[PDB]
Design a protein around this nucleic acid. Structure first.
Ligand SMILES: [Mg+2]
Ligand SMILES: [Mg+2]
Ligand SMILES: [Mg+2]
Ligand SMILES: [Mg+2]
Ligand SMILES: [Mg+2]
Ligand SMILES: [Mg+2]
Ligand SMILES: [Mg+2]
Ligand SMILES: [Mg+2]
Ligand SMILES: [Mg+2]
Ligand SMILES: [Mg+2]
Ligand SMILES: [Mg+2]
Ligand SMILES: [Mg+2]
Ligand SMILES: [Mg+2]
Ligand SMILES: [Mg+2]
Ligand SMILES: [Mg+2]
Ligand SMILES: [Mg+2]
Ligand SMILES: [Mg+2]
Ligand SMILES: [Mg+2]
Ligand SMILES: [Mg+2]
Ligand SMILES: [Mg+2]
Ligand SMILES: [Mg+2]
Ligand SMILES: [Mg+2]
Ligand SMILES: [Mg+2]
Ligand SMILES: [Mg+2]
Ligand SMILES: [Mg+2]
Ligand SMILES: [Mg+2]
Ligand SMILES: [Mg+2]
Ligand SMILES: [Mg+2]
Ligand SMILES: [Mg+2]
Ligand SMILES: [Mg+2]
Ligand SMILES: [Mg+2]
Ligand SMILES: [Mg+2]
Ligand SMILES: [Mg+2]
Ligand SMILES: [Mg+2]
Ligand SMILES: [Mg+2]
Ligand SMILES: [Mg+2]
Ligand SMILES: [Mg+2]
Ligand SMILES: [Mg+2]
Ligand SMILES: [Mg+2]
Ligand SMILES: [Mg+2]
Ligand SMILES: [Mg+2]
Ligand SMILES: [Mg+2]
Ligand SMILES: [Mg+2]
Ligand SMILES: [Mg+2]
Ligand SMILES: [Mg+2]
Ligand SMILES: [Mg+2]
Ligand SMILES: [Mg+2]
Ligand SMILES: [Mg+2]
Ligand SMILES: [Mg+2]
Ligand SMILES: [Mg+2]
Ligand SMILES: [Mg+2]
Ligand SMILES: [Mg+2]
Ligand SMILES: [Mg+2]
Ligand SMILES: [Mg+2]
Ligand SMILES: [Mg+2]
Ligand SMILES: [Mg+2]
Ligand SMILES: [Mg+2]
Ligand SMILES: [Mg+2]
Ligand SMILES: [Mg+2]
Ligand SMILES: [Mg+2]
Ligand SMILES: [Mg+2]
Ligand SMILES: [Mg+2]
Ligand SMILES: [Mg+2]
Ligand SMILES: [Mg+2]
Ligand SMILES: [Mg+2]
Ligand SMILES: [Mg+2]
Ligand SMILES: [Mg+2]
Ligand SMILES: [Mg+2]
Ligand SMILES: [Mg+2]
Ligand SMILES: [Mg+2]
Ligand SMILES: [Mg+2]
Ligand SMILES: [Mg+2]
Ligand SMILES: [Mg+2]
Ligand SMILES: [Mg+2]
Ligand SMILES: [Mg+2]
Ligand SMILES: [Mg+2]
Ligand SMILES: [Mg+2]
Ligand SMILES: [Mg+2]
Ligand SMILES: [Mg+2]
Ligand SMILES: [Mg+2]
Ligand SMILES: [Mg+2]
Ligand SMILES: [Mg+2]
Ligand SMILES: [Mg+2]
Ligand SMILES: [Mg+2]
Ligand SMILES: [Mg+2]
Ligand SMILES: [Mg+2]
Ligand SMILES: [Mg+2]
Ligand SMILES: [Mg+2]
Ligand SMILES: [Mg+2]
Ligand SMILES: [Mg+2]
Ligand SMILES: [Mg+2]
Ligand SMILES: [Mg+2]
Ligand SMILES: [Mg+2]
Ligand SMILES: [Mg+2]
Ligand SMILES: [Mg+2]
Ligand SMILES: [Mg+2]
Ligand SMILES: [Mg+2]
Ligand SMILES: [Mg+2]
Ligand SMILES: [Mg+2]
Ligand SMILES: [Mg+2]
Ligand SMILES: [Mg+2]
Ligand SMILES: [Mg+2]
Ligand SMILES: [Mg+2]
Ligand SMILES: [Mg+2]
Ligand SMILES: [Mg+2]
Ligand SMILES: [Mg+2]
Ligand SMILES: [Mg+2]
Ligand SMILES: [Mg+2]
Ligand SMILES: [Mg+2]
Ligand SMILES: [Mg+2]
Ligand SMILES: [Mg+2]
Ligand SMILES: [Mg+2]
Ligand SMILES: [Mg+2]
Ligand SMILES: [Mg+2]
Ligand SMILES: [Mg+2]
Ligand SMILES: [Mg+2]
Ligand SMILES: [Mg+2]
Ligand SMILES: [Mg+2]
Ligand SMILES: [Mg+2]
Ligand SMILES: [Mg+2]
Ligand SMILES: [Mg+2]
Ligand SMILES: [Mg+2]
Ligand SMILES: [Mg+2]
Ligand SMILES: [Mg+2]
Ligand SMILES: [Mg+2]
Ligand SMILES: [Mg+2]
Ligand SMILES: [Mg+2]
Ligand SMILES: [Mg+2]
Ligand SMILES: [Mg+2]
Ligand SMILES: [Mg+2]
Ligand SMILES: [Mg+2]
Ligand SMILES: [Mg+2]
Ligand SMILES: [Mg+2]
Ligand SMILES: [Mg+2]
Ligand SMILES: [Mg+2]
Ligand SMILES: [Mg+2]
Ligand SMILES: [Mg+2]
Ligand SMILES: [Mg+2]
Ligand SMILES: [Mg+2]
Ligand SMILES: [Mg+2]
Ligand SMILES: [Mg+2]
Ligand SMILES: [Mg+2]
Ligand SMILES: [Mg+2]
Ligand SMILES: [Mg+2]
Ligand SMILES: [Mg+2]
Ligand SMILES: [Mg+2]
Ligand SMILES: [Mg+2]
Ligand SMILES: [Mg+2]
Ligand SMILES: [Mg+2]
Ligand SMILES: [Mg+2]
Ligand SMILES: [Mg+2]
Ligand SMILES: [Mg+2]
Ligand SMILES: [Mg+2]
Ligand SMILES: [Mg+2]
Ligand SMILES: [Mg+2]
Ligand SMILES: [Mg+2]
Ligand SMILES: [Mg+2]
Ligand SMILES: [Mg+2]
Ligand SMILES: [Mg+2]
Ligand SMILES: [Mg+2]
Ligand SMILES: [Mg+2]
Ligand SMILES: [Mg+2]
Ligand SMILES: [Mg+2]
Ligand SMILES: [Mg+2]
Ligand SMILES: [Mg+2]
Ligand SMILES: [Mg+2]
Ligand SMILES: [Mg+2]
Ligand SMILES: [Mg+2]
Ligand SMILES: [Mg+2]
Ligand SMILES: [Mg+2]
Ligand SMILES: [Mg+2]
Ligand SMILES: [Mg+2]
Ligand SMILES: [Mg+2]
Ligand SMILES: [Mg+2]
Ligand SMILES: [Mg+2]
Ligand SMILES: [Mg+2]
Ligand SMILES: [Mg+2]
Ligand SMILES: [Mg+2]
Ligand SMILES: [Mg+2]
Ligand SMILES: [Mg+2]
Ligand SMILES: [Mg+2]
Ligand SMILES: [Mg+2]
Ligand SMILES: [Mg+2]
Ligand SMILES: [Mg+2]
Ligand SMILES: [Mg+2]
Ligand SMILES: [Mg+2]
Ligand SMILES: [Mg+2]
Ligand SMILES: [Mg+2]
Ligand SMILES: [Mg+2]
Ligand SMILES: [Mg+2]
Ligand SMILES: [Mg+2]
Ligand SMILES: [Mg+2]
Ligand SMILES: [Mg+2]
Ligand SMILES: [Mg+2]
Ligand SMILES: [Mg+2]
Ligand SMILES: [Mg+2]
Ligand SMILES: [Mg+2]
Ligand SMILES: [Mg+2]
Ligand SMILES: [Mg+2]
Ligand SMILES: [Mg+2]
Ligand SMILES: [Mg+2]
Ligand SMILES: [Mg+2]
Ligand SMILES: [Mg+2]
Ligand SMILES: [Mg+2]
Ligand SMILES: [Mg+2]
Ligand SMILES: [Mg+2]
Ligand SMILES: [Mg+2]
Ligand SMILES: [Mg+2]
Ligand SMILES: [Mg+2]
Ligand SMILES: [Mg+2]
Ligand SMILES: [Mg+2]
Ligand SMILES: [Mg+2]
Ligand SMILES: [Mg+2]
Ligand SMILES: [Mg+2]
Ligand SMILES: [Mg+2]
Ligand SMILES: [Mg+2]
Ligand SMILES: [Mg+2]
Ligand SMILES: [Mg+2]
Ligand SMILES: [Mg+2]
Ligand SMILES: [Mg+2]
Ligand SMILES: [Mg+2]
Ligand SMILES: [Mg+2]
Ligand SMILES: [Mg+2]
Ligand SMILES: [Mg+2]
Ligand SMILES: [Mg+2]
Ligand SMILES: [Mg+2]
Ligand SMILES: [Mg+2]
Ligand SMILES: [Mg+2]
Ligand SMILES: [Mg+2]
Ligand SMILES: [Mg+2]
Ligand SMILES: [Mg+2]
Ligand SMILES: [Mg+2]
Ligand SMILES: [Mg+2]
Ligand SMILES: [Mg+2]
Ligand SMILES: [Mg+2]
Ligand SMILES: [Mg+2]
Ligand SMILES: [Mg+2]
Ligand SMILES: [Mg+2]
Ligand SMILES: [Mg+2]
Ligand SMILES: [Mg+2]
Ligand SMILES: [Mg+2]
Ligand SMILES: [Mg+2]
Ligand SMILES: [Zn+2]
Lengths: 53, 64
RNA sequence: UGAAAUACCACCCUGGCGCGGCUGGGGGCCUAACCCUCGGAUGGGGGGACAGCGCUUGGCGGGCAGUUUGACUGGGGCGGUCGCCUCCUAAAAGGUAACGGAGGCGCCCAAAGGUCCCCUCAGGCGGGACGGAAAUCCGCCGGAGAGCGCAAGGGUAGAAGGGGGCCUGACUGCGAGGCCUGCAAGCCGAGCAGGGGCGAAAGCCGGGCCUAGUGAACCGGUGGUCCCGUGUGGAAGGGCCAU
RNA sequence: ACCCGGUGAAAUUGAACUGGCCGUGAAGAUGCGGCCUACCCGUGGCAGGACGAAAAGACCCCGUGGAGCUUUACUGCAGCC
RNA sequence: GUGGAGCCUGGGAGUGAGGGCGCGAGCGAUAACGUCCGCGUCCGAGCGCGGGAACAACCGAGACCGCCAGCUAAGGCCCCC
RNA sequence: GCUGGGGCUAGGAGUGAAAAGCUAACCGAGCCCGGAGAUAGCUGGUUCUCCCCGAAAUGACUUUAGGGUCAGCCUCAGGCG
RNA sequence: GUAGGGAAACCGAGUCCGAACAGGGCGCAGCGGCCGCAAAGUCCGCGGCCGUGGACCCGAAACCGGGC
RNA sequence: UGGUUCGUGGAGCCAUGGGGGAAUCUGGGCGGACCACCGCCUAAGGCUAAGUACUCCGGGUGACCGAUAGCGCACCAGUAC
RNA sequence: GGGGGGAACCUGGGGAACUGAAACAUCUCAGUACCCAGAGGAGAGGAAAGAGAAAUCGACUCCCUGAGUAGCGGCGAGCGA
C-alpha cells in the first residue's frame, strides 16, 4: 500500500453492503473495480463495486 | 482491606465454569485489508489462555 | 394579443427614497455613575461613560513552577546500532553469541491472480539487405549454466519459465490434525456446507515458486446489524460484524 | 625534647605467641611452602612496611536517585495585551 | 534398564554477575589469568580428604560416627619424608 | 572612614561595590516541628538444634541490562506405574 | 454453593458462531449389606504463600505545610 | 467551576462566581441529554431530643510491661542540660 | 451580651507534598497533613421541590448488609457509590 496503491472496499451492488477489502494501483487501474463475489447477505454471487475505504 | 477486582481483566476476559480463562484473539483491531479471510475469521474466536497467565489473571478476579 | 392583456379595488414581490419603530457601527458634544483634585465637601474644578474593577474570549509569556531529556557499549562519551528477510560463522537433527564476515525489506501485481490448452531456455558455431559483440531470420550442437518483478538461499523445464481462451476461489460459513513456541504471536492444513470459475473429464481454485514487504492494547472514524436503550414509547449514547 | 616528684588524655584497637629472602597465593604475605636468620624485656631515636590512621572516593560509572542553572524541550502559572 | 528413575496435577522457592580446564570455532596478534558461542567437566556449593613444594577448579577421590586393624588410588620408596 | 545605642527587611524570600557571598561556627535555597515509619529496583544486618533432598548464574521479552514476568533447573503433597 | 452459554436480547443441559439439522468453542456425569459410609459444597480452627497497609529492620540526598 | 461513582462523557441531579431573567397551583422542581406520556415532589425562612464521635477526668478489668521494659518521667521531669 | 481557655472528638472557611502510576503532566496520595473561624458535652444532619420503578417507600443520624456490586478511570495505576 502507498499513495498510488490504495486500499479499497468492494460493495455488493444489490444490497449495498461492503463485503470485501482489497487494493489496486490507481495509476495502473484508474477505473473502479467491478468483480463478481459471493455476497453473504444475498447468499449468491453478485457484482461488487470498488468503494472508498 | 478486601481485594479489589481488577477491571481491565474483567473487561477483557472470562473464567469458564471449569476455571479456564478465555479471551478474544488479538490482531484484527485494524490493518485488516490484506489479511486473508482465514486470518480474519479465526481471529474472531475466543481462545484459552496458557496456564501460567490464566492463573495470574484469575487472582485478579477474586469474586467472579 | 401573448405564457400572462388591459378600466378599476386588493394583497405582495423587485428595487429605491422619504418619515418614523427598533437596534450595529463609527464622528462629535454633554454630566450625573466611576476616577483625580480643591483650607471650603448635599459644593467647586479636571478627566469621563473612557479608565478602574467583575465574568468570559483568544494571544504573548524561563519572571516563575512541575518535569522529561532511551538502551546496547571490552568504562562512559563520541560514532555506529535497535524490527524483519537471506547466507556464513553453527562443531552433517533443531537451536546457538560477539560493536564477527556479507547483502537485502518497510514494496509490488487487476495480472504478476484461478483454471484449461499449447510452447521451451541461456549459450556456441555456420548462414542472412540496411544490421553492429548483441535487434530480427535459418540450420546444427546445446539438461539446464537462462528464466522465475527486487537480496540471498532453496527449489524448478516430467515447470514454478513463455503465449493464449474463459474468468474473480485476491470466496462466505467453518475446520480434523499439526509445525513452531515462555506468553502473545507466527505458519501449514485435508475435509464438510453455501454460492461460483475453468475443464469433456479425473479434478484444481480459500491470491502470487517459497522464505522479507510489518505493529499488540487503548482512544476515535466510516459502512452494516437492529442486540442494549436508566418509569414507558422514542431518542442520545453504546455493543456486535466489517474496515 | 631527656631524667626525677605531682596530675594524667587521644584517635586507634577481630584476636596475636606480629623476623628476612625466593616462591606461591584474589595478581605487592609476620600468618602458606622451601630455605635463611633469630636468647628474654625495655629506653631514646628514624619513618621503608603493616596495601599504616582519618573521612561508607569529591574523580569515574551506575540508579527509569536529588537538587541549582538554561533555553526557539514539554506543559502550566503570574504578569501584560 | 525399579532408579532420590519417569509422567500428571497442585503448594513453596531460589537463580536469571559465573569461573577455570579439555575439545570445536569466531573476535584478538596461529597475544592475555583476554573476549564470545558450542559439547563436556570440575569449582561455585566438595577453600572436606591424598598427590602436585606451597595453590577454587591438573591428577586421585564424592567426607553418617568411632577404632593405636587391613587393601589400594594418584603420586611415590637416598635423607628432610 | 570606623564605631556605640535604638530600629526595619527572611526562606524561592531578604540583603549583596556581585564571591551564588551572607541571612546565628557547613547556605546553588536557613532552622524547628509536622506530612513521616516519604521513597531507596541500592549497601548493611537478620538470633536455638537435628534430619532428608538440593539448585542457578541460561532462553524470550522488558526506558531493560547489578531490577523484573514467563520458561528452564530445586523441593514438598496427591496421582500414574 | 445448587447451571451454563452468549456483547446482549435471549435460550437453557445446553448455548454461541452459522443458512445448517454442518463443524467447532465453552459447558453438562460413588462403595457396599432402604440404612451405612464416602462426597458436591460450605463453615470454623490451623499452616504455607499472595494482595492492601510502613509489611523483615535500620539508612538518604530531597519535596511540602505551619511556625522560629 | 465545585460536589457525586461520574476525569466532558449521551452528563442529568445538587451547589454557584458572571450575564440575562419569570410565574403563585391552569404555579413550579424531579424521575441521567432531549421530546411526549405516566408518575413523584412542593425550592428560594428558621428550630428540633434520641440512637453516633472522643477520653483531659473517675472507676473496673487484662493468656498487657516490670526499671534498657511500660508514658519522655515509678524517683522533686517536660526538670537537669 | 461578647472577648479567653479546653486532651481528643465535631462543623465550616482555606488547603499541600513526598509517594503511587516501577519515568511523568491528567490521575494518585487527599479534601489527607496543616492553617483558620466556630461549636459543645457532643457536633453535624433532620421532618422531602426526597428516593426511583416497587401499582412502591416515607425526616435525620448511626451500625450490619447490599458491594469491591453499579459504575468512574492517561478504561493505566487505581477510585468507588
Ligand atoms: Mg480497563
Ligand atoms: Mg483483535
Ligand atoms: Mg492494535
Ligand atoms: Mg473492529
Ligand atoms: Mg472501530
Ligand atoms: Mg497478501
Ligand atoms: Mg482470503
Ligand atoms: Mg479479504
Ligand atoms: Mg465473520
Ligand atoms: Mg458476589
Ligand atoms: Mg460464580
Ligand atoms: Mg468631552
Ligand atoms: Mg465631573
Ligand atoms: Mg468636567
Ligand atoms: Mg475634556
Ligand atoms: Mg470599560
Ligand atoms: Mg465571552
Ligand atoms: Mg484568557
Ligand atoms: Mg517557554
Ligand atoms: Mg525551569
Ligand atoms: Mg513529583
Ligand atoms: Mg520520556
Ligand atoms: Mg525517556
Ligand atoms: Mg548506558
Ligand atoms: Mg568503549
Ligand atoms: Mg564487549
Ligand atoms: Mg570490560
Ligand atoms: Mg577495557
Ligand atoms: Mg550517541
Ligand atoms: Mg521479537
Ligand atoms: Mg545453523
Ligand atoms: Mg548450520
Ligand atoms: Mg544445524
Ligand atoms: Mg523444535
Ligand atoms: Mg553495534
Ligand atoms: Mg541496512
Ligand atoms: Mg493473461
Ligand atoms: Mg541458438
Ligand atoms: Mg550470427
Ligand atoms: Mg551486414
Ligand atoms: Mg547478427
Ligand atoms: Mg537460474
Ligand atoms: Mg535487487
Ligand atoms: Mg498461463
Ligand atoms: Mg491465464
Ligand atoms: Mg462465463
Ligand atoms: Mg490445532
Ligand atoms: Mg504457541
Ligand atoms: Mg514473523
Ligand atoms: Mg463446493
Ligand atoms: Mg460447486
Ligand atoms: Mg464446482
Ligand atoms: Mg462445464
Ligand atoms: Mg466441479
Ligand atoms: Mg481448500
Ligand atoms: Mg510471483
Ligand atoms: Mg503465476
Ligand atoms: Mg511475496
Ligand atoms: Mg502478518
Ligand atoms: Mg493507555
Ligand atoms: Mg470502542
Ligand atoms: Mg450502531
Ligand atoms: Mg429495543
Ligand atoms: Mg429518563
Ligand atoms: Mg426510556
Ligand atoms: Mg408515540
Ligand atoms: Mg422497546
Ligand atoms: Mg426514529
Ligand atoms: Mg444506534
Ligand atoms: Mg473486524
Ligand atoms: Mg634516672
Ligand atoms: Mg613524670
Ligand atoms: Mg596469641
Ligand atoms: Mg617473636
Ligand atoms: Mg603467579
Ligand atoms: Mg597479602
Ligand atoms: Mg610475595
Ligand atoms: Mg615470618
Ligand atoms: Mg600458622
Ligand atoms: Mg598449607
Ligand atoms: Mg609458613
Ligand atoms: Mg614464611
Ligand atoms: Mg616454614
Ligand atoms: Mg635470611
Ligand atoms: Mg621504640
Ligand atoms: Mg614507618
Ligand atoms: Mg616522627
Ligand atoms: Mg605487614
Ligand atoms: Mg606505610
Ligand atoms: Mg601505606
Ligand atoms: Mg589507608
Ligand atoms: Mg581503616
Ligand atoms: Mg552512608
Ligand atoms: Mg562509596
Ligand atoms: Mg563514590
Ligand atoms: Mg565521602
Ligand atoms: Mg562530577
Ligand atoms: Mg568508572
Ligand atoms: Mg546520574
Ligand atoms: Mg529514563
Ligand atoms: Mg533502570
Ligand atoms: Mg530523574
Ligand atoms: Mg530537579
Ligand atoms: Mg526545590
Ligand atoms: Mg535426585
Ligand atoms: Mg531430581
Ligand atoms: Mg517411585
Ligand atoms: Mg512444582
Ligand atoms: Mg511448601
Ligand atoms: Mg513455604
Ligand atoms: Mg535472581
Ligand atoms: Mg524470581
Ligand atoms: Mg539480568
Ligand atoms: Mg547474564
Ligand atoms: Mg560476571
Ligand atoms: Mg558463559
Ligand atoms: Mg560474560
Ligand atoms: Mg577452555
Ligand atoms: Mg569453554
Ligand atoms: Mg590433549
Ligand atoms: Mg587445539
Ligand atoms: Mg578452544
Ligand atoms: Mg564460530
Ligand atoms: Mg610471536
Ligand atoms: Mg575469562
Ligand atoms: Mg586462553
Ligand atoms: Mg582463546
Ligand atoms: Mg564451563
Ligand atoms: Mg555465589
Ligand atoms: Mg573436587
Ligand atoms: Mg559438585
Ligand atoms: Mg578441592
Ligand atoms: Mg580449596
Ligand atoms: Mg589440607
Ligand atoms: Mg589439593
Ligand atoms: Mg598438596
Ligand atoms: Mg607436599
Ligand atoms: Mg590447588
Ligand atoms: Mg587458580
Ligand atoms: Mg557420601
Ligand atoms: Mg600394601
Ligand atoms: Mg602407582
Ligand atoms: Mg620427592
Ligand atoms: Mg624413610
Ligand atoms: Mg551604629
Ligand atoms: Mg545598629
Ligand atoms: Mg540593637
Ligand atoms: Mg531592606
Ligand atoms: Mg528581614
Ligand atoms: Mg520570619
Ligand atoms: Mg528555602
Ligand atoms: Mg519554608
Ligand atoms: Mg519548589
Ligand atoms: Mg530572591
Ligand atoms: Mg558591602
Ligand atoms: Mg541556629
Ligand atoms: Mg554562617
Ligand atoms: Mg533546593
Ligand atoms: Mg524548595
Ligand atoms: Mg546558618
Ligand atoms: Mg507543628
Ligand atoms: Mg504520607
Ligand atoms: Mg527515611
Ligand atoms: Mg523517588
Ligand atoms: Mg529477622
Ligand atoms: Mg545429596
Ligand atoms: Mg541469561
Ligand atoms: Mg515477551
Ligand atoms: Mg525493547
Ligand atoms: Mg534485549
Ligand atoms: Mg542502563
Ligand atoms: Mg553493561
Ligand atoms: Mg536496577
Ligand atoms: Mg519462576
Ligand atoms: Mg526434572
Ligand atoms: Mg509424591
Ligand atoms: Mg454472562
Ligand atoms: Mg449474531
Ligand atoms: Mg456444541
Ligand atoms: Mg466437549
Ligand atoms: Mg461425612
Ligand atoms: Mg469438609
Ligand atoms: Mg502464592
Ligand atoms: Mg501503612
Ligand atoms: Mg515507612
Ligand atoms: Mg512493617
Ligand atoms: Mg508481608
Ligand atoms: Mg538541605
Ligand atoms: Mg516535588
Ligand atoms: Mg523539585
Ligand atoms: Mg514558612
Ligand atoms: Mg452550570
Ligand atoms: Mg462535572
Ligand atoms: Mg470533577
Ligand atoms: Mg465516557
Ligand atoms: Mg454529571
Ligand atoms: Mg429534565
Ligand atoms: Mg450564579
Ligand atoms: Mg443550576
Ligand atoms: Mg401542578
Ligand atoms: Mg407550569
Ligand atoms: Mg431544580
Ligand atoms: Mg434543571
Ligand atoms: Mg424524581
Ligand atoms: Mg428524648
Ligand atoms: Mg444534641
Ligand atoms: Mg445525639
Ligand atoms: Mg464512649
Ligand atoms: Mg483510666
Ligand atoms: Mg512479665
Ligand atoms: Mg508481674
Ligand atoms: Mg533503671
Ligand atoms: Mg524508662
Ligand atoms: Mg534490675
Ligand atoms: Mg518509655
Ligand atoms: Mg505519668
Ligand atoms: Mg531531676
Ligand atoms: Mg475571636
Ligand atoms: Mg482568637
Ligand atoms: Mg469558647
Ligand atoms: Mg472543609
Ligand atoms: Mg469563614
Ligand atoms: Mg476547600
Ligand atoms: Mg478542613
Ligand atoms: Mg498553596
Ligand atoms: Mg504529584
Ligand atoms: Mg508515601
Ligand atoms: Mg503509597
Ligand atoms: Mg503501588
Ligand atoms: Mg512515581
Ligand atoms: Mg517508581
Ligand atoms: Mg523521577
Ligand atoms: Mg506525581
Ligand atoms: Mg481527591
Ligand atoms: Mg489530624
Ligand atoms: Mg474557641
Ligand atoms: Mg450522648
Ligand atoms: Mg444541632
Ligand atoms: Mg440545623
Ligand atoms: Mg417543612
Ligand atoms: Mg451479591
Ligand atoms: Mg477521591
Ligand atoms: Zn448483497
Amino acid at each position: 500500500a502507498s499513495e498510488v496503491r490504495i486500499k479499497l472496499l468492494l460493495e455488493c451492488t444489490e444490497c449495498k453492503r461492503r463485503n470485501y477489502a482489497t487494493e489496486k494501483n490507481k495509476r495502473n487501474t484508474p477505473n473502479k473495480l467491478e468483480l463478481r463475489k459471493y455476497c453473504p447477505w444475498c447468499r449468491k454471487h453478485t457484482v461488487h463495486r470498488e468503494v472508498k475505504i | 482491606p478486601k481485594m479489589k477486582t481488577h477491571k481491565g481483566a474483567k473487561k477483557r476476559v472470562k473464567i469458564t465454569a471449569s476455571g479456564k480463562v478465555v479471551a478474544m484473539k488479538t490482531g484484527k483491531r485494524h490493518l485488516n485489508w490484506q489479511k486473508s479471510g482465514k486470518e480474519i475469521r479465526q481471529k474472531g474466536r475466543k481462545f484459552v489462555l496458557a496456564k501460567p497467565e490464566a492463573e495470574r489473571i484469575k487472582l485478579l478476579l477474586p469474586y467472579e
